[PDB]
PDB file of N, CA, C and O in Angstrom:
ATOM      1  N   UNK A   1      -3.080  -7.335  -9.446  1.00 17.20           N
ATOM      2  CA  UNK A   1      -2.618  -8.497 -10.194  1.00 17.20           C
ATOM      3  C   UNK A   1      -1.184  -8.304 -10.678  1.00 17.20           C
ATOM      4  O   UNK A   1      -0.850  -7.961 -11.812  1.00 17.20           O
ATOM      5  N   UNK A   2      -0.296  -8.609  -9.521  1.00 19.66           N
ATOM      6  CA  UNK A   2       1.094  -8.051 -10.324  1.00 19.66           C
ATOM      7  C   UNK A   2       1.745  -9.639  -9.912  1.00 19.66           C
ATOM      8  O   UNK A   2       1.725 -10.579 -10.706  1.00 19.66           O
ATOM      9  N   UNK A   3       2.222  -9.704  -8.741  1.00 23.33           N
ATOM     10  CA  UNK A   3       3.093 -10.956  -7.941  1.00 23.33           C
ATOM     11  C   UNK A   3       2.884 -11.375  -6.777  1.00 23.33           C
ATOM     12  O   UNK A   3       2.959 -10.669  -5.772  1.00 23.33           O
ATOM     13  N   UNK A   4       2.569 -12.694  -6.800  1.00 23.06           N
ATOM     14  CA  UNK A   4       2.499 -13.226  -4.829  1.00 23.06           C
ATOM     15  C   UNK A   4       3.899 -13.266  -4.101  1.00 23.06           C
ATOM     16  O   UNK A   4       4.930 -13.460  -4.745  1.00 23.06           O
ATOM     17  N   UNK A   5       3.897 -13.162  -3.349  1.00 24.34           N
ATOM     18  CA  UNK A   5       5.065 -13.230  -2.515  1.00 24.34           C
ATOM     19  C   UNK A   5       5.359 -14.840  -2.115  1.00 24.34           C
ATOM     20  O   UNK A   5       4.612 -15.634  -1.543  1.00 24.34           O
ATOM     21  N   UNK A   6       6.537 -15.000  -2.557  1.00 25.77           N
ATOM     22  CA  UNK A   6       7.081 -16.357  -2.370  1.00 25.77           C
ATOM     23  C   UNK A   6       7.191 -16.391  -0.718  1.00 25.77           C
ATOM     24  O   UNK A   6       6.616 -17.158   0.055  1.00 25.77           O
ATOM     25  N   UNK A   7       8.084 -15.349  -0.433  1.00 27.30           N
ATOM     26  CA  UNK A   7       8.135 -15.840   1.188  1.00 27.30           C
ATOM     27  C   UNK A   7       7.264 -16.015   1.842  1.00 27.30           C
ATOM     28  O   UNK A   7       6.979 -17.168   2.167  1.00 27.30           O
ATOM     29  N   UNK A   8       6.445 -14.825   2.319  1.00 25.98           N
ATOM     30  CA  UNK A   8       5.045 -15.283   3.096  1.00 25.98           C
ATOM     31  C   UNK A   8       4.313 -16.307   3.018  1.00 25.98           C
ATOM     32  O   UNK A   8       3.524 -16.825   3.809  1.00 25.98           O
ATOM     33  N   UNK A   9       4.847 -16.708   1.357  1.00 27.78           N
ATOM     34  CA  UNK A   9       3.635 -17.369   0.734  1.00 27.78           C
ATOM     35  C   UNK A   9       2.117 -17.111   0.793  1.00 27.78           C
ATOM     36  O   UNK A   9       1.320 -18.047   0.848  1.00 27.78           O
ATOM     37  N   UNK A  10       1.809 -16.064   0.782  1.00 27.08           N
ATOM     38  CA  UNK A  10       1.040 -15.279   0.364  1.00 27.08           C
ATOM     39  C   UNK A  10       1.155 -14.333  -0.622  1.00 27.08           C
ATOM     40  O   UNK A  10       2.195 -14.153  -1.256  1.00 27.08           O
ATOM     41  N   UNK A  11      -0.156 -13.544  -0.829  1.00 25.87           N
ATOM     42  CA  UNK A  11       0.283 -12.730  -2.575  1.00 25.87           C
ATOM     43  C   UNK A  11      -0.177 -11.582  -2.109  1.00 25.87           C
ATOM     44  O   UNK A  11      -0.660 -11.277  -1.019  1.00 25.87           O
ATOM     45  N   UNK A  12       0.115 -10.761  -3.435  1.00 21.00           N
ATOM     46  CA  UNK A  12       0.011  -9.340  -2.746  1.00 21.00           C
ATOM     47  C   UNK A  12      -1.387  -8.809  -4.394  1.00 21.00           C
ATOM     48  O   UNK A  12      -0.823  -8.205  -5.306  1.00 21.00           O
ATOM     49  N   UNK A  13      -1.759  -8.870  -4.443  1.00 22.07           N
ATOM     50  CA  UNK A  13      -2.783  -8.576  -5.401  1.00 22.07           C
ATOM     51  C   UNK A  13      -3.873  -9.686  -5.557  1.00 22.07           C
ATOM     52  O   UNK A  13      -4.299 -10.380  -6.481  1.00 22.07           O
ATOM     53  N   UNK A  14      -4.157  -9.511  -4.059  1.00 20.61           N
ATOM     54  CA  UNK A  14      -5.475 -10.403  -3.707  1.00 20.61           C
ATOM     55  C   UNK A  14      -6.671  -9.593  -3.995  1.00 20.61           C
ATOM     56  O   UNK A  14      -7.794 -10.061  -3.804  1.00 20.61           O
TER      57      UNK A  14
END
């Protein structure tokens, strides 16, 4: 649970 990633638009603490 930190930040999704804008670019991918995906997140990274799924």
């Amino acid at each position: 649970i930190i930040y999704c990633n804008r670019r991918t638009g995906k997140c990274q603490r799924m």
